[PDB]
Design a protein around this ligand. Structure first.
Ligand code: NAP
Ligand code: TOP
Length: 157
């Protein structure tokens, strides 16, 4: 099982200046719940942004840099390496990885952030022509979590 795991806004912004544009504790809990006990594949910049590997799952960083050898992180050097990892693999970002993988994955877990953020990094356009909504769940709003948001599980048709 290969899946995309992404949050993006109404214009498919995912990133600004190597961080998430929004503060949304609930999306990160969503991420924790989905990926715990499984495998994340991410690009180097995304990892640097996050600093350390997420506890309680396999962290895999795709990078060209032969000197990368960080404790708790496995490194891969080619996309083709992804297909050799066992178990449930989530493509974790960023833009380059989504572009390379979106035609390849079984499904996508997308948080739609119902807002318009200033961004420098984007999720690629897709159609629901190609993707079936297996589920759509409204995020609940509170004072911790103030941006409307929807969790989609999409499966390739
Ligand atoms: N909203 C979300 O769900 C979400 C999730 C993740 C990240 N983000 C955001 O996305 C942005 C970062 O994305 P980004 O696209 O700029 O960078 P990125 O995907 O985090 O990392 C790009 C780097 O990954 C490595 N890489 C990618 N494809 C490769 C390949 N085929 N072979 C070898 N190495 C490869 C390269 O590392 P080297 O240059 O070291 O070789 C490349 O420079 C940030 O703003 C971040 O906050 C958002
Ligand atoms: C869990 O913390 C982070 C997670 C992510 C990636 C990410 C965040 N949300 C969703 N829905 N999918 C993703 N792939 C990206 C981050 O920074 C760029 C994080 O730290 C702030």
């Amino acid at each position: 099982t290969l899946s995309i795991l992404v949050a993006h806004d109404l214009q498919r912004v995912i990133g600004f200046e190597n961080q998430l544009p929004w503060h949304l504790p609930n999306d990160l809990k969503h991420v924790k719940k989905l990926s715990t006990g499984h495998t994340l594949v991410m690009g180097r910049k995304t990892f640097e942004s996050i600093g350390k590997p997420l506890p309680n799952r396999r962290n895999v960083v795709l990078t060209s840099d032969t000197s990368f050898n960080v404790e708790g992180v496995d490194v891969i050097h080619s996309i083709e390496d992804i297909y050799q990892l066992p178990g449930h693999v989530f493509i974790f970002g960023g833009q380059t990885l989504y572009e390379e993988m979106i035609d390849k994955v079984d499904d996508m877990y997308i948080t739609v952030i119902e807002g318009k953020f200033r961004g420098d990094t984007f999720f690629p356009p897709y159609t629901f022509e190609d993707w079936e909504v297996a589920s759509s769940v409204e995020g609940k709003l509170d004072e911790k979590n103030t941006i409307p948001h929807t969790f989609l599980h999409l499966i390739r048709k």
